[PDB]
Write a protein that binds this ligand. Structure first.
Ligand SMILES: [Al+3]
Ligand SMILES: [Al+3]
Lengths: 400, 400
């Protein structure tokens, strides 16, 4: 009874985190009902020959092929389709040759050709190009060749069997793709777009909050969560960006997104934000340490550090705003030039010799923080140029 | 002809990088030949009822289940086995109930139970626990229930069909696992162990080379590769560590490794090395910059920075040596205490005021480098304690 309560509240939070998981769970069952009723009630005619010979394979296709995104099922469906076509042609050819050879060497020769192909294709599944794009196609290539060659049929039956396999894969895959595209779509390109703009938002949050909280019992643990967990969620999402980009390359043009859309540029901007998260991680550790400088030693540098941190935070905020609405923007340029002027003001402040009355270990912590902020300012200048190049590549609208 | 040359040399380098890919490609074809000859020649008797009714499903199982590691195929095989057992029992039960209800409502009630289960299981595939361990088991659960419920057989035939499905999954999976375990094994626990010791080695390489090359046309690009690519290979391997740990939790005890072996501690030590790679990344950027300090300004600090960097490099080297031979070691403690004494010597050197005749922008770069080295020294102290706790958890041998 107790673990029943735990699993129903776990289901409650999994559904509450994204409700499109509930709609995807209904779309899978709808595709199963649609495919099974097509092969049972047989609408236009009582099809025979290869049409209604096998119908468990259509349900196998729909269960395997359906996926949460649109590019995920389109990738699985197109891989399964072309692999079944090619391996079906090679399977009919293998049965022709092995029948032509002999009558008792025929199971021997067929199992040797299956050994050779499997070995050949299992080695090709370690190539990096085939690994990132078409690994499932090579698996279905092995599978379909070994189904057709190692069956116990003959020169007509094999032909019917190959056609049946090809036709039931096409019907199951097309039913999956039409329900995926036309009911409630979950585009992976929109999820990559939203994940990028959310990452910009969390970094802007830390920069403004560092501009305040650098110069100050459960509230300490609350702000500990609010600082640490956000940029630590940025660092652990290299893989999510990689996966959504591989899916979003498969999708058709929808809405605002053009047919050609630069997803590799999205992963490049994600990598630059991860470098900013490295520097933000270093700052956080120093902030949370126990060895803290006396506060007025920071208060003699409190002006241009506040200006640098706040203006780079506003630059990240304006870039996230311009990516959420897909426009070309020029607010980030003004907020970047202000941080550049603040860095030059700090460089003229440091020659004034205001740090000649300070212990050098405090100077170690102080010059670490100044170096981290200068690095983050130059990094946000790079991300501003890169987001501008992404905004011209995707042909964002020119409204502003 | 030209792309043929390109693909054969790509195959040459893919085989040369790891030759166990060639042996795995032979093991897959051997499992296909073994399974197909078992179902064709039918050794002990001409089995009937459920034994030789279906034999394409054994080859489907062997193609899908076989994987490069040992824990990978053991995970796929055990997931497929228990999912086929449970969904077979529920499928026979569903056909019993739907036959008991009516005679014309029976296809309607069967397709509604398939809709409910698919919806129920596709929602559970978003849980994080089920996602990291048993996602393929839930997929085979959907598949086997929908094969048994949506067939056109009746009260005896269904029973034979369920048993046949269960028996051919067990035979294909056991043939895969015995060839995987008993021919040439590729253990994923040994690959995680070797990947950890290699990561320690690349970090030790950078620390010694930084101790030399901090104080100095294609040779510049050569050492650019030799510095940059190593620690950048450390940073991009969070996922590899995660995947090999999930596989290595499935494996039986082999050789030196005990039945209980702490793979989560391996991923914890990998995370601490990734923090060291963050700090090493910051140092590299400064080293490669164009704004360089005049060299004698570094040469007045050249002594304890050399001692700190070299002793932490020797500590990483001794930890990698002790992890390659699986012993408990005490060389890392002496090499850590030397770096601690060097840090205190630097702290007494900085109070002497040798940095009062230097421009403060040069002091910014200098105090950045000193802060990075102090952070790396304290980090290697943490990794030394954590590798000691891993070395007692796994009960390494006490030879030294
Ligand atoms: Al015909
Ligand atoms: Al019987």
């Amino acid at each position: 009874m107790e673990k029943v309560r735990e699993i129903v509240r776990e289901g409650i939070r999994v559904g509450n985190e994204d409700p499109r998981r509930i709609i995807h769970a209904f779309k899978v069952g709808l595709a199963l009902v649609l495919v099974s009723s097509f092969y049972y009630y047989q609408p236009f005619g009582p099809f025979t020959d290869y049409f209604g010979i096998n119908a468990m394979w259509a349900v196998a296709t729909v269960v395997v092929v359906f996926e949460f995104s649109v590019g995920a099922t389109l990738g699985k469906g197109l891989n399964r389709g072309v692999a079944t076509l090619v391996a079906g042609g090679l399977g009919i050819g293998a049965h022709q040759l092995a029948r032509l050879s002999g009558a008792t060497v025929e199971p021997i020769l067929l199992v040797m050709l299956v050994f050779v192909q499997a070995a050949l294709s299992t080695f090709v599944r370690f190539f990096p190009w085939v690994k990132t794009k078409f690994d499932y196609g090579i698996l279905i290539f092995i599978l379909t060749f070994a189904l057709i060659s190692l069956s116990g049929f003959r020169d007509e039956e094999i032909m019917d069997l190959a056609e049946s396999r090809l036709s039931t894969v096409v019907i199951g895959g097309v039913s999956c793709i039409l329900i995926s595209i036309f009911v409630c779509p979950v585009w992976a390109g929109q999820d990559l777009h939203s994940l990028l703009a959310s990452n910009f938002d969390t970094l802007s949050h830390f920069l403004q909050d560092f501009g305040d909280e650098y110069f100050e019992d459960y509230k300490v643990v609350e702000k500990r969560k609010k600082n640490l967990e956000r940029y630590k969620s940025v660092l652990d999402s290299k893989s999510d960006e990689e996966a959504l980009a591989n899916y979003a390359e498969w999708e058709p043009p929808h809405g605002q997104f053009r047919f050609r859309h630069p997803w590799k540029q999205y992963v490049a901007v994600g990598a630059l934000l991860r470098q900013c998260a490295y520097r933000i991680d270093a700052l956080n550790s120093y902030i949370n340490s126990d060895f803290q400088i006396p506060v007025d030693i920071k208060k003699k540098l409190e002006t241009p550090l506040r200006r640098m941190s706040s203006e780079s935070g506003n630059s990240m905020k304006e870039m996230s705003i311009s990516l959420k609405q897909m426009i070309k923007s020029s607010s980030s340029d003004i907020h970047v030039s202000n941080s550049q002027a603040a860095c030059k003001s700090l460089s003229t402040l440091l020659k004034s010799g205001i740090l000649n009355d300070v212990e050098p270990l405090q100077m170690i912590s102080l010059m670490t923080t100044v170096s981290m902020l200068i690095d983050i300012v130059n990094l946000t200048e790079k991300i501003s140029e890169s987001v501008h190049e992404l905004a011209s590549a995707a042909r964002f609208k020119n409204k502003m």
